Every structure is written in structure tokens, then in C-alpha cells.
Design a protein around this ligand. Sequence first.
Ligand SMILES: O=c1ccn([C@@H]2O[C@H](COP(=O)(O)OP(=O)(O)OP(=O)(O)O)[C@@H](O)[C@H]2O)c(=O)[nH]1
Lengths: 123, 300, 139, 146
Amino acid sequence: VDHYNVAQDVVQMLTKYRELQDIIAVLGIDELSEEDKLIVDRARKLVKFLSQPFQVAEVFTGMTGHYVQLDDTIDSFSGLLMGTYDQVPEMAFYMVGGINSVLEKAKKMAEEAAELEKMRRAR
Amino acid sequence: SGKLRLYKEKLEGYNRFYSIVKTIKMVTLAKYRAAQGRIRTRDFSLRYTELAFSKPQASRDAVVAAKNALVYIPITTNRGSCGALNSNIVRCIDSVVSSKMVLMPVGKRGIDSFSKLYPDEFRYGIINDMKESMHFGYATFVIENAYEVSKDADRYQVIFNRFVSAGVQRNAVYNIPSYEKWKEDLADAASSDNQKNRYLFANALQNEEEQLIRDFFDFHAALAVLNAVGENELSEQAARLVAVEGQLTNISSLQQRTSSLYNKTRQFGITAALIEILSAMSSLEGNAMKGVRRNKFWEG
Amino acid sequence: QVQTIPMIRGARFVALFNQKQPSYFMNAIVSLYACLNGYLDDVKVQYVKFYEYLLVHRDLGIMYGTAKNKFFYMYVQELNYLIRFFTLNSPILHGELEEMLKQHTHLFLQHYQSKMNAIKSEKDVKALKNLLYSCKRAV
Amino acid sequence: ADSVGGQQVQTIPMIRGARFVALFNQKQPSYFMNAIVSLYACLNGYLDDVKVQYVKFYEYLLVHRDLGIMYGTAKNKFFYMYVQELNYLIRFFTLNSPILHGELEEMLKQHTHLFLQHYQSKMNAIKSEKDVKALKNLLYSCKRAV
Ligand SMILES: O=c1ccn([C@@H]2O[C@H](COP(=O)(O)OP(=O)(O)OP(=O)(O)O)[C@@H](O)[C@H]2O)c(=O)[nH]1
């Protein structure tokens, strides 16, 4: 039942994201409501999170592959829909497997940003 | 086959139509976004104009006792596809037709529509290019022509469209009484408790010299005209976006109905041909037969 | 958006038509009668399925001790043939039918819909959606 | 797609797309060196200041002529369009290589500057009944010449 509910919620959010794309084009992003602007952020994370690096391309692409378990995927999407991962950057969901990979990528992105800012302050 | 391609040509035309209408949607989108600033910045210029002219009078006594030309200045769009705005305005004008009615419509749709329907009542119109922003000079041009159409006019009315929201466009009215009637009412408000909210305003204007009052009357009348045209433009672009979407969907439904008839036609065309060939193959086989078999039947 | 009486009842009727398993004759006709008579006007569209479930698989009046009907209690499946026989508009079964419907509507609006309209927590929202999914799939 | 009315605006992608769609017009096959060089010039924006009508004439001068040598301004040592044997060097070494990239840009820059200074300037100043016809015939001939 949890799998079905999550899947339907994802589909509904994606469908709503399409209509909001049209609306923001009509007037603009700021014209949407708080509710709708939170839904345009989660949807973009979902679209990025549905991509995955395949182990078959560990050679010609260079990125380690992932094999996400069924239960892990359900939990990851369920948490994302609720809004638990509303602080993680959008790009942390791009070409990753599972939720732990998202956290690891976010930490690496945060560390890289901190180092770059620290280097800039020196010069 | 021509019949199949007839549908294909028909569907080919609808495809180009969708693209062109799509282009219109984008053009109007930019002008809608540019004109969306008025929504924020409206509703404050016309504050003392209300006191000058805001008079919730009856709709019968105003027109029944007309002894001088009643000039109407309906606002109409140059280009069609706007929606029901022009149609409603015509209904609003048709409902107030009278002996003394004179028409000075705005927009090509206004001139053409009101010239034929009410010949004697139409004198001439004003056409403005939608190239620059609706400015004061355009409003002054409307008023000057209106006066010269009928200087001894009991009232000058402006019938335009108010853009309440993206999907709400009402029909609004600005009635402007000529100088003589306005100063008479301005005189009663100052001298009496009646028109209380206008008591201080009436006395304030009464103190100053006449030429200033005449300038004040013309100035605020121009502002009311400026507001109407500005709102009518914003209602126009908003309406066109709604209408254009309707045309897109109608042209999409046709594309889905002519495609089926095209895919249904090719299937029938293939079947009919093969049946027809295979009915002329059966006939040839049936009419033909094998002759007496000349072989050593005994040798078996 | 002007919502007249026909529009409201029609939307409720459409929501009720959403089914997964066949419904017993008594349960279906009773729910249709309640919607037809306007008992669901105050009930939101998204909550109709939950309202119907409480009427068939639950009894609010007995739960909150405000019920006095003698026979017309929905847990009595034997009433189906009695309803099939006379009608739902017969004086024999009309008075009690109205009474239980009014009590069920009053209790539902007082207790359940009021709380459902006061849910903002994300966790509670998820729980509410799961509840609605279950009700829609089960009567 | 939006150019059907609306007074299409000439962004750099459009300023270069039109030239590309005009270079593809040809009658006879093009030698690899001539074709690759011309595409590279239009890709880096050397034709942004060249009107779409004169693109073919610009290409013809680049291939069958050498403005730098004509005006005694060429400074490249080996990279000249009249060296038809550079084709295999370009095939082995891409135009985006230090061996050829430096001289290639120099020649294109010099050719573009000379063309705008001398030829296109006169073209925009044509006002007559016979000069216009001569220009039109010249452009058509260059259209099917390269
Ligand atoms: O010939 C005249 C007479 C009067 N006025 C004008 O009529 C008005 C009558 O105004 P008031 O009598 O109420 O006051 P005021 O003269 O002190 O006012 P100000 O000049 O400070 O505005 C004043 O503004 C005066 O200048 C003229 O402009 N011309």
C-alpha cells in the first residue's frame, strides 16, 4: 500500500508541476502561491532524483553505478514528498542512487563550496 | 491516393494554424506582462475625480430629459479575437439608443460596427496605433474631438472594460456632465448640506477663478479617459490570451478528429485494394480448370 | 463559481459512484438517498467516501449515545429485503431513516470534518491522505 | 518558429544560423578544406557583420582569392587557402589545435576585416540601374560557384 500511495503522489506532483510550468510562463514564478512554489521545488528534486547512474557505464562514463533497493526507493521518495529534505540543494539529487548518496553528495558540495569561499577570502 | 491526401492536406493546414496561433499567444503574452504593471499602479490617480463626477444617478431620468446631444465614446479594440468585450459594449450602447445619441467610438471595430448599425448617430471615430504607451495626449485628442462633435452636449459618456482580474473583465462607465450642468451641481453642493462629501470640495473650487475651474474640469475629464483606455487595453490583452487558448484547443480537437479519419482511411484503402486484387485472382482460377489427365493410370 | 443545489448533489453523486468492489443493495441505496436529500451538502467532496464508510461499517449515534431508532440501524443487514419490499419513502421506514441520517450527519460534521479541516502538520496530512485512499478503496 | 510575424529579433544564435543555412546552398561538391574552414568562420562569429546576401561572395573570396596577399597584409607563414594540401593536415590536426588555430584565426580576422572595409562597403553604396543588376548577377554566380 505504501508503494502505491507514494507512486500516485509522485504522479500527481509531476502532473501539477507541468501545469505550474505553464502558469509561471504565463505570468511568472512570483505569481504562484507559497504552496505552489513549494511544490515547484519538490517536483524539480523529483525529476532530478529519478535519474540514475548505471554500473554498465562505469567505464565509458566514469561514475560508479548504483542498484537502489525497492524499499529504499519508496522511503526516499516518501520522505521527499513530506518535505523532510527541503534543505538539501536541488543538484544533490542529480545522478545518484538512494537517499544516502544524496546526503553524501550534498556534504561534498557543501565542503567544496566552503573551500572555494575560504580560498576567495584569502585573495 | 487523393482522398487520403485530401485529409492529409486538411490536417497539414491545421498544423500551420496551430503554430501561427501559438505565435499570437506569445506576442500577446509579452504585451500582457508589460501591461500588468497597471494592476499594481492603478486605483490612486482618480481620487478627487470621484468627487468631481461620481454621482450615482438613476438610469432613466438621466436620458429621458435629454434636450441636447448625448455623446457616447465607447472603447473598442482595433483587432478582433478579443472576445465578448466589443459585443457587450454594443449591447450596452443598443440599450441606450435615443434621438439625441451621438457616437464617437474608439477602435476600428468600433468605427466599422457602429457606422453600419446607427448611421445618423455615428459622426466619426478615433484610431490609435498600439505602438506607444497610452498617454495623456491621446486622451486629450479624444476629448477635443468629442466637444467638436457636440459642444452643446448634455453629457459625454465613456463605456470601457475594467480588468478586475485575469479572468474578470466588467463593463464600466464614466459619465461626464458638460460645464454648465457641472458648475450648477457644484454650486448646490457648496450652498447646501446635500452632497455632504462634496461640501468642502465644492467650496474649495468655488473660491478660485473660473479659468482654473474650466482647466480643472478638462484635466480630470482627460484622466478619466486615460484610465478607461488604459484599462480597456489591459482587459484586451487578458481577454485575447483567454480567447487564443480556446482557439488552440479547438484547432487541436480538429487535428485529433482529422487524423483518425486519415488513419481510418488508409486502412480501408489497403483492404479494399487487396480484396479487389484477390477477387480477380479467384475468378481467373475458378474459370480455369485442369484437363483430362493423360497418364498411364494402369501403371500403379 | 456559482454552485447551486443541483451542482452540489451532482458532484457528491459522482464521488459516490467511485467503487472498487460491489456494494450491498441496502448500503448503496441508503447512501444515494442521503445524497439525494441534501444530507451531504455540508460534507466536502474529498470526504464523501469517508462519510459513506462510517455510515456502513460504523455507527456514530451508538458510539456517542445519541441514537433512539428501534430497527433502522445499518448493521442490520436483514433490513435490505424490507427496504426492497416497501420503499425507502414508506412511512414504515421513512421516519427512522431520516432520524439516523440526521444524527449521522450531525455527528460527522461535529467531530470528524471539523478535525480534518484543522490539519496542517505534514505528518497529519500524510495520514489523512492514507486514510482517504483506504476509504475510497473500501466503500 | 516565432519569426512568422513579430519582427524576429537577431540574437547571436540567429545571426549565425542564417549564415549556416545560406552556406549550405551549393551546386558542386566542396573540397573538405574549403567547407570546414567556412563553417568554422561562421561558427566563431566572423560573419556576424556580413549581410546574409553577401555570404556566398564572402566564401568565394576566402576560397578562390586571398585578400591579405592582394593588399600585402598577410602575415601567416604556411596557412593560406591556396595551399590545397593543408586538407590532410587539418584532418590529422583539428582546427582547434595550437598548430593551426593561431594562424587560422589570423587569416579569418584579416580576411573579414578586408572584406568589410573594401567590398561590402561598396555594395551598400550601390545606387544605379546597371550596378544593381551587375551586383545581383555577381551574387547569383557566386551562389552556384562555391
Ligand atoms: O484676481 C485674483 C483674485 C484672487 N486670486 C486667487 O484667489 C484665491 C483666493 O483665496 P483666499 O482668499 O481663500 O486666500 P489667499 O488669497 O490667502 O490665498 P493664496 O493667494 O495664498 O492662494 C487666492 O489663491 C488668490 O491668489 C487670483 O488668483 N486672482
